[PDB]
Amino acid sequence: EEIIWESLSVDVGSQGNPGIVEYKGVDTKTGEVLFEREPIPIGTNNMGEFLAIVHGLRYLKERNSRKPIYSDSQTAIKWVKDKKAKSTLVRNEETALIWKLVDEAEEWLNTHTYETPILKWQTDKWGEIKANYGRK
RNA sequence: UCGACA
DNA sequence: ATGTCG
Ligand SMILES: [Ca+2]
Ligand SMILES: [Ca+2]
Ligand SMILES: [Ca+2]
Ligand SMILES: [Ca+2]
């Protein structure tokens, strides 16, 4: 379809997978960075993509914005839709932080409401999502 | 056996 | 390579 420029685009950035994970949200039109998560020692790409969308949901809700959120992650979009992050990253002391954030994100989703449309960013047609990290 | 999204 | 879904 056509790009809805009046929106929020989110993405994960990592060093290894599993590895160090962070994420950010930007204004789709300008690329202005609206939020960024402090790096988490160990996590997966999908967990990060998931946390980015949920944070985007909370970010927009707090500001009473009805703008949609763009994510290029089929997995993260589904996890948010199901309000359940089906990650199989092992749960141990080293992954405790990322899992805490994931569990808290799920917790938020199951105790709050929103109608924010979560749209699939069509990378194969529009290029890389505006919140992207690293080379293509 | 892949196909796809990262 | 690894994380996930269809
Ligand atoms: Ca992405
Ligand atoms: Ca988070
Ligand atoms: Ca949803
Ligand atoms: Ca990237």
Say which residues have a Cβ less than 8 Å from residue A109's Cβ, sequence separation at least 6: A54, A57, A80, A83
> For domain A1-136, is the CATH number 3.40.50.300?
no
The two structure tokens encoding residue A99: 């899992």
Instruction: Return the closest-CA partner of residue A52 out of A136, A133, A126.
Output: A133
User: What is the whole-number distance in angstroms between the Cα of residue A59 and the centre of ligand 3?
Assistant: 15
Resolution in A, one decimal? Answer: 1.6
Domain chopping of chain A, boundaries: 1-136
Give me the sign of the Cα torsion angle A50, A55, A56, A62: positive
Alpha carbon distance A24, A132 (integer Å): 9
User: What is the whole-number distance in angstroms between the Cα of residue A112 and the centre of ligand 4?
Assistant: 30
Q: How far is the CA of A51 from the C1' of C2 (A)?
A: 19
DSSP string, chain A: -----SSEEEEEEEEETTEEEEEEEEETTT--EEEEPPPEEEE-HHHHHHHHHHHHHHHHHHTT----EEE--HHHHHHHHHT--------SSTTHHHHHHHHHHHHHHTT------EEEP-HHHH-S-TT--S--
User: What is the whole-number distance in angstroms between the Cα of residue A49 and the centre of ligand 3?
Assistant: 14
Surface-to-core class of residue A115, CB atoms within 10 Å of its CB (0-12 exposed, 13-18 middle, 19+ buried): exposed
* Method of determination used here: X-ray
Which residue minimizes Cα–C1' distance to B4?
Answer: A74
